Amino acid sequence: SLMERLGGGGFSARIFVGLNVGDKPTYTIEDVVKDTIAIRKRQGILPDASFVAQRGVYTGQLVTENSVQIIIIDLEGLSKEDFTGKVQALGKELREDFKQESVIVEIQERGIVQDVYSITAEWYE
Amino acid sequence: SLMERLGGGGFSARIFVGLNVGDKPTYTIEDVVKDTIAIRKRQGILPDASFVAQRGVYTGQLVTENSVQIIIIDLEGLSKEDFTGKVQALGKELREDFKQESVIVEIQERGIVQDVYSITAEWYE
Amino acid sequence: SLMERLGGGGFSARIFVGLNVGDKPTYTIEDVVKDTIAIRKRQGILPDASFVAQRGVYTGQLVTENSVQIIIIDLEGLSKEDFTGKVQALGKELREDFKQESVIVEIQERGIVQDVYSITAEWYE
């Protein structure tokens, strides 16, 4: 076994996606992973990512929903803003593909949070 | 979709709660989430939080238990010590509500760990 | 309940292990936890660790696999390199015990990533 130190950290991102339309359980974690590979394939990047399941509670009223935590590592060796741009594009497309009111995107470097973007739908009301 | 940068990080906390009394599986993750909303409701804060399931191994002997990872974000915009105080209150009440011998509380800012508090029961022996 | 501040963080590590041989689902999360206690028992360290389940997607072709996230805390109070050495030994042995092509090892301190080691099999080809 060859042990190689890839570095001190690098850029990573985390995307949180709910599975409810309003308050109805609708999508599964398998829906989000299959749709995440498809989006990043069209981006040209390697769609390599991992997914963690979560239980969520949020508020207007209080809903309990299942959510999915998406972890992306900057494997293709991009700059921070080319990497941030595609993650934000993935989050924006993920919010539409699952009719979410909001999607959180959090960019990290060596585990330290650099930015946390809010992707909110502008539904007319 | 409106993309707004909420900031560079903020304060967050993580609470780890076991599900065993001594060595007997007793509680589920649904027990911890329902009891976590109830506590933070009485605190006045928005009870918004997410929950991740875990498998645990700890030591006196070695027990394997299911545990729950609770993630709290400082959404209400508190100072670090008003936020830390309520998390520590939530952890202290969670340890009693599930008869835990110990509960770990870890405060973060932008993902960097600031403090890790130990909440241990003082059972007479 | 006695609340004691253990410190500002400490050393922690994360080990990611897949469950597929090539592309066939083979092992479960229970296989990895039982084998992780056994290895760290032989290391002399307290085998205390937690385990999180994951869904994985990686690329040569694209495979979808279940994986396990192993979280280790420096409870025994070692130096960074005695702690790093045993984690790397655990990762190296874990890669063999489950016939993995690669295993990622990531050392943290107070949540900040210090090193990310790659443990790759040198299969002759």
Residue numbers in the entry:
A (entry chain AA), B (entry chain AA), C (entry chain AA): 1 to 59, 64 to 129
Show passages lifted from the paper.
Svi3-3 represents the first structure of a phage-encoded SAM degrading enzyme. The subunits pack in a triangular manner, forming continuous beta sheets with their neighbors and are each in a ‘velcro-like’ topology where residues 2–6 at the N terminus of one subunit form beta-sheet interactions with residues 120–124 in β8 of another subunit. Prompted by DFT calculations producing high energy barriers for a hydrolysis reaction within the active site of Svi3-3, the TLC assays and NMR show unambiguously that Svi3-3 is a SAM lyase forming homoserine lactone and MTA.
Crystallization in the absence of ligands led to a lower-resolution apo structure. The structure of Svi3-3 in apo state is overall very similar to the complex structures (RMSD of 0.84 Å over 124 Cα atoms), but there is a shift of the N terminus, a conformational change of residues 7–9 to form a more extensive interaction with β9 and the preceding loop of the neighboring subunit, leading to a slight loosening of the trimer. Small angle X-ray scattering (SAXS) data confirmed that Svi3-3 has a similar trimeric structure in apo state as in the presence of SAM, indicating that product release and substrate binding do not require trimer dissociation. Svi3-3 forms a trimer in solution both in the absence and in the presence of substrate. Comparisons of the apo and ligand-bound structures as well as MD simulations indicate that stabilization is caused by tightening of the trimer around the ligand. Comparison of the average root mean square fluctuation (RMSF) of the protein backbone shows that Svi3-3 is more flexible throughout the 100 ns MD simulation in apo state (RMSF for trimer 0.91 Å2) than with SAM in the active site (RMSF for trimer 0.86 Å2). Thus, 100 ns of MD simulation demonstrated that apo Svi3-3 shows the highest flexibility in the regions surrounding the active site, and that these regions become significantly more rigid upon substrate binding.
